[PDB]
Coordinates of N, CA and C in Angstrom, one line a residue:
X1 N -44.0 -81.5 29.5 CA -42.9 -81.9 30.4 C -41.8 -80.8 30.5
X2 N -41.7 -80.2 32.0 CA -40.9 -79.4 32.0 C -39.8 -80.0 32.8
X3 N -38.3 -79.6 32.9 CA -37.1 -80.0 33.4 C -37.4 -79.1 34.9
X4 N -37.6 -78.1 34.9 CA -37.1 -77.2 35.3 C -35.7 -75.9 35.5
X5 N -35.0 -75.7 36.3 CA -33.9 -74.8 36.6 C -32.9 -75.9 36.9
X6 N -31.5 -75.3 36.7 CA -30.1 -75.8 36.7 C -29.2 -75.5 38.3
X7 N -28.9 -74.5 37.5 CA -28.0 -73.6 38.1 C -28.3 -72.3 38.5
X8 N -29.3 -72.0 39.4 CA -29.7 -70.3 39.9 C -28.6 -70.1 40.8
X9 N -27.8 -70.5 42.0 CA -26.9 -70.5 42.6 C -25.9 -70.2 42.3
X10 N -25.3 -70.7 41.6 CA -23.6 -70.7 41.5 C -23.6 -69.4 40.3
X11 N -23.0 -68.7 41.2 CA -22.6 -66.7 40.7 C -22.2 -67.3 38.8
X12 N -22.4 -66.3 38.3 CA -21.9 -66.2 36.9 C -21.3 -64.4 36.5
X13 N -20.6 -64.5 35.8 CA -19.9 -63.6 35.4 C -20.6 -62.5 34.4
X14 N -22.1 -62.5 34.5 CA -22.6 -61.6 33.9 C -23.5 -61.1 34.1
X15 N -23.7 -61.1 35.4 CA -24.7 -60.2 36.7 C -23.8 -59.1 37.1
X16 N -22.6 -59.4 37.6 CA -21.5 -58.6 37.9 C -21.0 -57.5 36.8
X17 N -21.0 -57.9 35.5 CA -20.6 -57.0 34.4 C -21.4 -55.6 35.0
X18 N -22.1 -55.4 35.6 CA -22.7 -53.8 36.1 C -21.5 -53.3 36.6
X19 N -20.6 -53.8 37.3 CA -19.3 -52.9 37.7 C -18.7 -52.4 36.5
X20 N -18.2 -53.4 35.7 CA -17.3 -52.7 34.6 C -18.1 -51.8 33.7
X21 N -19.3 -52.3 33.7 CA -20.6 -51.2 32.8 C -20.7 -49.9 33.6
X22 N -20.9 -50.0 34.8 CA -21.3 -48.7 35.3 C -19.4 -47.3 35.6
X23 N -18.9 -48.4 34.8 CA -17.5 -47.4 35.0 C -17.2 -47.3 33.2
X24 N -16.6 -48.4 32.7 CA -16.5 -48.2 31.1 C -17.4 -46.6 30.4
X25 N -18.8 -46.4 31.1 CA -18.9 -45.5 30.9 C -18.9 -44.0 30.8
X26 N -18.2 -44.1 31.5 CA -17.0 -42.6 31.0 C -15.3 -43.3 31.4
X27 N -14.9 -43.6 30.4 CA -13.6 -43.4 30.3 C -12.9 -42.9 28.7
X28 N -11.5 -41.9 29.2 CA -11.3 -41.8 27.2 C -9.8 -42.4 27.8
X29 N -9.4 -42.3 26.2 CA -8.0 -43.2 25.6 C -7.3 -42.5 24.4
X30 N -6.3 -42.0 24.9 CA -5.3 -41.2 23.9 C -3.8 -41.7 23.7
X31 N -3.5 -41.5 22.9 CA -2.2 -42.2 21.9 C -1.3 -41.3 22.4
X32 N -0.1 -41.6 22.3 CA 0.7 -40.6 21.9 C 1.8 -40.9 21.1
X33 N 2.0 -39.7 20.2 CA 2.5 -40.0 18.6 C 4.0 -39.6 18.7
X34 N 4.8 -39.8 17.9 CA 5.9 -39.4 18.2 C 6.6 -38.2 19.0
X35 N 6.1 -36.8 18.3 CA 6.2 -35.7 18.8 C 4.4 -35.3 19.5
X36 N 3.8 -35.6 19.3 CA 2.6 -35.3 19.2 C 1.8 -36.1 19.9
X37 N 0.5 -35.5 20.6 CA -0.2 -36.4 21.4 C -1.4 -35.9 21.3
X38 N -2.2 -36.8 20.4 CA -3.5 -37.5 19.8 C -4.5 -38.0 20.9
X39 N -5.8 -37.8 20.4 CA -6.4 -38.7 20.7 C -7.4 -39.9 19.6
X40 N -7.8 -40.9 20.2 CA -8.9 -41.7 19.2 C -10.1 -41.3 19.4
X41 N -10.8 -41.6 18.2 CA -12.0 -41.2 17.9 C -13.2 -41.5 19.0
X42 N -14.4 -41.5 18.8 CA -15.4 -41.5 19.8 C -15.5 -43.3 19.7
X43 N -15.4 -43.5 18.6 CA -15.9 -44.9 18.3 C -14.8 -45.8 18.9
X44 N -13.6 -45.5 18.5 CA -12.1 -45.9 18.9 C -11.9 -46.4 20.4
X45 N -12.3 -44.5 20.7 CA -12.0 -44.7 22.1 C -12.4 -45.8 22.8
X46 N -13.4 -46.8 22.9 CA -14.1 -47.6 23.0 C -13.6 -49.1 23.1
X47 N -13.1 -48.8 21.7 CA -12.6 -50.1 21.4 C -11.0 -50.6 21.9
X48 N -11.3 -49.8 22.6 CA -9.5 -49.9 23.4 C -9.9 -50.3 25.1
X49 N -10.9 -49.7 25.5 CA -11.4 -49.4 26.7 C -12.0 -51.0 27.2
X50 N -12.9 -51.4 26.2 CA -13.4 -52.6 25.9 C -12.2 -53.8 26.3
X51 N -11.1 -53.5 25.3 CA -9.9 -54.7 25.4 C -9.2 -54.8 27.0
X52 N -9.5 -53.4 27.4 CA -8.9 -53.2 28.8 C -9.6 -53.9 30.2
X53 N -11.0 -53.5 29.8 CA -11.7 -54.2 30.7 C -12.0 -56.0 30.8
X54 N -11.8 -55.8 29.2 CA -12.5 -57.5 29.2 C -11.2 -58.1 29.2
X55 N -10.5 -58.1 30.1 CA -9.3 -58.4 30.3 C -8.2 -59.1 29.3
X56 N -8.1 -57.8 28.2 CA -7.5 -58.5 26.5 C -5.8 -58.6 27.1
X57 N -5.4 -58.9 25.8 CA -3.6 -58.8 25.9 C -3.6 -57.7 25.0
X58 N -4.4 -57.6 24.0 CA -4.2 -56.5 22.8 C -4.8 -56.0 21.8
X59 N -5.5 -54.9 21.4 CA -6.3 -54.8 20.6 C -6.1 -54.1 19.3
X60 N -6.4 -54.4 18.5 CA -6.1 -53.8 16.9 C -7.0 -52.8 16.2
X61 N -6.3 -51.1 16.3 CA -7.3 -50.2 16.4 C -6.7 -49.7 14.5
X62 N -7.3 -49.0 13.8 CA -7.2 -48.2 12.5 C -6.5 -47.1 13.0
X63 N -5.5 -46.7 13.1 CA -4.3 -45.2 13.3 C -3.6 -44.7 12.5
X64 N -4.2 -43.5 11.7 CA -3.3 -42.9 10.5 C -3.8 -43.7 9.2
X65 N -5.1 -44.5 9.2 CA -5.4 -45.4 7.8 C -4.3 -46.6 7.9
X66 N -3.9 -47.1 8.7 CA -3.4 -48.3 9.0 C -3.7 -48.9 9.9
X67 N -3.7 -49.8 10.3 CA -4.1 -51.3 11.4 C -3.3 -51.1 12.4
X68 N -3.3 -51.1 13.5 CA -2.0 -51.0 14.1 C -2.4 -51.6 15.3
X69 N -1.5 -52.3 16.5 CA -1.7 -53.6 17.2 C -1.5 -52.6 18.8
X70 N -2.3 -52.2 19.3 CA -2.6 -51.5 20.6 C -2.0 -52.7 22.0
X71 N -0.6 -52.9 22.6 CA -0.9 -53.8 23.9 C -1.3 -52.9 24.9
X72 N -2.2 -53.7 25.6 CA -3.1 -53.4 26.9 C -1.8 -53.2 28.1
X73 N -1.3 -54.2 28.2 CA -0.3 -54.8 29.1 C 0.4 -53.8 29.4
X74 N 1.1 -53.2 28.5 CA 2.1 -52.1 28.5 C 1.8 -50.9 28.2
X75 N 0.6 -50.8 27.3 CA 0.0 -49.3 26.8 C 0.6 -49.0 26.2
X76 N 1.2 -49.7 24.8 CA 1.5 -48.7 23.6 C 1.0 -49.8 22.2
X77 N 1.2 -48.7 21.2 CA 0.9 -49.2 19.8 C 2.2 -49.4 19.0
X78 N 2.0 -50.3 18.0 CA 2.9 -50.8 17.2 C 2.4 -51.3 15.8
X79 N 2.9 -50.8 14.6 CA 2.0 -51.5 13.3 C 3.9 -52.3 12.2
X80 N 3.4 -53.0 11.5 CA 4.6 -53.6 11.0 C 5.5 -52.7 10.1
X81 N 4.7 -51.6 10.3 CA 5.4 -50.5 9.1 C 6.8 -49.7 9.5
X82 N 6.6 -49.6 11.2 CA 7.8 -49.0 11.9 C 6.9 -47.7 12.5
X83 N 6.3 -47.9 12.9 CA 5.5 -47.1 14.0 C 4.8 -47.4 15.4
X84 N 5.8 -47.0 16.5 CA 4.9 -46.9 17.6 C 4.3 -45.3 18.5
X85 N 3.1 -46.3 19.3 CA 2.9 -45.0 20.5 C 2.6 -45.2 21.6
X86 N 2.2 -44.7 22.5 CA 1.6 -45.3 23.7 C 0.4 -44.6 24.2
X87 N -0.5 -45.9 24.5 CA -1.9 -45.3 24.9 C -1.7 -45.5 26.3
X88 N -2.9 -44.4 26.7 CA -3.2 -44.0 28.2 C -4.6 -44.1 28.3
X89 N -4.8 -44.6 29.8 CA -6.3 -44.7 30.2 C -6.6 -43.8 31.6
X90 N -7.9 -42.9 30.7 CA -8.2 -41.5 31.9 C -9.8 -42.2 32.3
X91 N -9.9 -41.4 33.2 CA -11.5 -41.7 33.7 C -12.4 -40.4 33.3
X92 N -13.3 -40.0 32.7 CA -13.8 -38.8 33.2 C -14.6 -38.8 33.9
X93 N -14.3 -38.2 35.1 CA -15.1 -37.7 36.2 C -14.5 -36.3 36.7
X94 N -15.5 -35.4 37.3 CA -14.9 -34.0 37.6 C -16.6 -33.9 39.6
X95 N -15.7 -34.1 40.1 CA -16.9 -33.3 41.4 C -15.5 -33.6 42.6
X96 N -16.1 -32.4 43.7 CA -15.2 -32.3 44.5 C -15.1 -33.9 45.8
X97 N -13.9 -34.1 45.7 CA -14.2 -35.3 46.5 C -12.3 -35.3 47.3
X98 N -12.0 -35.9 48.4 CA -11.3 -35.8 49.1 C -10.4 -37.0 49.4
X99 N -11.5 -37.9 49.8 CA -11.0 -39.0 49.8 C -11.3 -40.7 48.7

């Protein structure tokens, strides 16, 4: 006894993920520290990129061996200790293009 199919029709939200997949893949994400401007790690980088895309409020990355609470919204970091920074979101792409 088979039922058969439900729902083939009505769009779902994870056919589409190829847009944010075929871009998430090259993007980086760097901090910037008081005087100083850092970047996150290979792994890191990611995990910021991820919160961005998957439409987060904020993500909580390891910076300096502490925890620290990344908002997306505004692009900066904050940990309870009395440290912030602000991250930025680049694309890498490099070819001659105009428009």
């Amino acid at each position: 006894g088979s039922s058969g199919s439900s729902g083939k029709s009505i769009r779902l939200a994870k056919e589409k993920e190829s847009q944010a997949d075929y871009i998430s893949t090259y993007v980086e994400w760097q901090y910037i520290d008081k005087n100083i401007t850092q970047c996150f790690d290979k792994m890191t980088n990611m995990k910021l990129e991820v919160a961005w895309k998957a439409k987060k409020k904020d993500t909580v990355v390891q910076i300096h061996n502490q925890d620290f609470t990344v908002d997306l919204s505004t692009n900066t970091a904050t940990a309870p200790q009395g440290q912030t920074f602000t991250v930025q979101r680049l694309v890498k792409a490099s070819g001659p293009s105009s428009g």
